[PDB]
Structure 1
Amino acid sequence: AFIERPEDFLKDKENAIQWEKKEAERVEKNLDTLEKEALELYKKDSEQISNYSQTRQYFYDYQIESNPREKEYKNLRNAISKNKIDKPINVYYFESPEKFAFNKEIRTENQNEISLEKFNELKETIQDKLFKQDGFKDVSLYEPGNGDEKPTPLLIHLKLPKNTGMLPYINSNDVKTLIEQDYSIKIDKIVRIVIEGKQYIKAEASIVNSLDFKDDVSKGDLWGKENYSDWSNKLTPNELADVNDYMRGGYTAINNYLISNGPLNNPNPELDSKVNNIENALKLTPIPSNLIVYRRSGPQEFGLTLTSPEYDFNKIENIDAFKEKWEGKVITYPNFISTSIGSVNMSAFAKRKIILRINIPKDSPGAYLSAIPGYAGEYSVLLNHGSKFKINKVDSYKDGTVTKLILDATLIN
């Protein structure tokens, strides 16, 4: 071994384990009793603690605040985010292909080979997509090899950047590594490899960071006010008139005009003027970072109604049919569309079942409207008319007894 660790231990399992063991010993010096307690509980109940860490943000603020699971979540997250790596490191872990919206077996566990058909199917499915990752996850510093456990045919080989939080620790005989996923994954390349007489797909992956405030609406609002106090003074009086008209409830007429293709079917020069100014207003201060926003969609955006049998997502077949129709598809909104920096549920859309979780690239047209006094309570970001969103992945979760859907999507224009 060298005096300095490599960025990737590769198949050097013996040096990876020894290095991470030293690292576990060193970080033990920096964890307080509450953090050590958090780690111990995690060892004893990892699956449920990880599950909670993935969906805790989607409930009412007061439901989140009252959940006793918050203590474990916050304390374990503190433990992790505190040991930041000072240069990149590559990690290894297995995923279900379903995680990247490949809702079939790549091969069965008793098959040893992977067909060219399946390889190409997978490639087309996970090509050109950012996949949002959340929650606690155990990873390995070395590539699984002969006599390592290999639960699926899909091995992720992930490059983590400098300042990534990672918690090395020991669980009885084993040296482990905990991270909290808080980024999107891009699959740069896939390759078929062989480990111990079986074919696996190895996915060469990297991350894209975005601001994701989740349930921390106060922080998101601070960020929004910080970046959009200016904006409201930068508008021509025409633009300011036209955006308050929109916000003050003009949106319904303006958006119906757009959705009905009025500009072409039945031009109305006044409305076209309003559409134009609102668009120019959204280009005035483009979204200053990569940013995750959330929208609770009405079923009509996905061709359903309240009484559609297909909107009953408590039945798995309806989830499958939804995925078959929408997952991997690109959708377009002729209307201007509102989103929030917050993921929390709210009274006004408490029962909506379809949540869009949207990655907005830096410099996209958009505005934090809750910098403009009068309507702060929504923590709103308005997106430009004609936006296109690629749906990368559909997840589901329980809100009480009601199954709801999370649509991992990316703004692509």
Structure 2
Amino acid sequence: QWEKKEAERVEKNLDTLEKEALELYKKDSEQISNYSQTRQYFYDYQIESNPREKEYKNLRNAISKNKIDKPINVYYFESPEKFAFNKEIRTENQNEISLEKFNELKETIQDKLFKQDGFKDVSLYEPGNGDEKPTPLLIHLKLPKNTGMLPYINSNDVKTLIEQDYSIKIDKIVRIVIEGKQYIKAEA
């Protein structure tokens, strides 16, 4: 209702190449995501020659074209090896998490400052029934004053495309039950 209206309205006051970058995002989400994560590690001629730079910065300006006015709580899943936990919490066909893996994760994700990078889609509400949940770790993030959020539609739902120039700080992790599976909700 609200997000549908505002999203369908932002998809008009976008520049034609901005909508180009947004629609070619729905094709190369993984590829343009990784390239936004690792674009800055080249030579300059290796930068302005790369055909993805056009859509990259078009998408970046589209995002930063609408910054929020007050802090927001977002939710998104993450893999454990994003936080240097190179083991598995549990395989997504298992239903339980052992206290040992919980203690190991808590020991390894409590005292670091994980820099983030590139674009990523997030949500404004916790996962429910029908949403896809491939990873056991659920990151509940707080986006502050003036952070670009772009709401787009994959023909039935809404995603919030943001860019990550921050560093997330884990506060507390708890083990959660959702639909008879055991995930981890970590406050960041």
User: How would you bin the TM-score normalised by the shorter chain?
Assistant: over 0.9
Once the two structures are TM-superposed, the CA of residue 59 in structure 1 deviates from its matched residue by: 0.7
Measure, in 1, the Cα distance between the counterparts of 2:129 and 2:101. 24
Superimposed CA distance per residue, residues 308-347 of structure 1 (whole angstroms, 9 cap, x where no aligned partner): xxxxxxxxxxxxxxxxxxxxxxxxxxxxxxxxxxxxxxxx
TM-score by length of 2: 0.96
Once the two structures are TM-superposed, the CA of residue 54 in structure 1 deviates from its matched residue by: 0.5
Measure, in 1, the Cα distance between the counterparts of 2:5 and 2:68. 14
Measure, in 1, the Cα distance between the counterparts of 2:124 and 2:148. 14
Superimposed CA distance per residue, residues 267-315 of structure 1 (whole angstroms, 9 cap, x where no aligned partner): xxxxxxxxxxxxxxxxxxxxxxxxxxxxxxxxxxxxxxxxxxxxxxxxx
Measure, in 2, the Cα distance between the counterparts of 1:167 and 1:73. 14
Q: Which of 17, 32, 44 is the matching residue for 2:15?
A: 32
Q: Which of 186, 189, 198 is the matching residue for 2:172?
A: 189
Measure, in 2, the Cα distance between the counterparts of 1:195 and 1:146. 9
Are residues 1:147 and 2:130 paired?
yes
Measure, in 1, the Cα distance between the counterparts of 2:12 and 2:102. 46
Higher helix share: 1
Measure, in 1, the Cα distance between the counterparts of 2:16 and 2:94. 47
Contact kept, 8 Å, 2:17 with 2:55, in 1: the verdict is no
Aligned with 1:36: secondary structure? helix
TM-score by length of 1: 0.44
Are residues 1:127 and 2:115 paired?
no
How many residue pairs get aligned? The number is 187
Contact kept, 8 Å, 1:129 with 1:186, in 2: the verdict is yes
Superimposed CA distance per residue, residues 113-150 of structure 1 (whole angstroms, 9 cap, x where no aligned partner): 11111111001100021101101101111100233210
| Equivalence for 1:138 | 121
Once the two structures are TM-superposed, the CA of residue 23 in structure 1 deviates from its matched residue by: 2.0
| Equivalence for 1:159 | 142
- Deviation above 6 Å: which 4+ runs of structure 1? none
Measure, in 2, the Cα distance between the counterparts of 1:78 and 1:48. 19
Contact kept, 8 Å, 1:27 with 1:83, in 2: the verdict is no
Measure, in 2, the Cα distance between the counterparts of 1:23 and 1:193. 32
Aligned with 1:57: secondary structure? coil
- Write out aligned runs for 1:9-408 (5 A): 18-204=1-187
Once the two structures are TM-superposed, the CA of residue 21 in structure 1 deviates from its matched residue by: 1.3
User: What stretches of structure 1 of length at least 5 have no aligned partner?
Assistant: 1-17, 205-413
Question: With CA pairs under 8 Å and 6+ residues apart, which has the higher RCO, 1 or 2?
Answer: 2
Once the two structures are TM-superposed, the CA of residue 26 in structure 1 deviates from its matched residue by: 2.9
Once the two structures are TM-superposed, the CA of residue 64 in structure 1 deviates from its matched residue by: 0.8
**Identity percentage of aligned residues:** 100
Superimposed CA distance per residue, residues 133-187 of structure 1 (whole angstroms, 9 cap, x where no aligned partner): 1011011111002332100100111010010100001112221110111111101
Of the two, which has the highest radius of gyration?
1
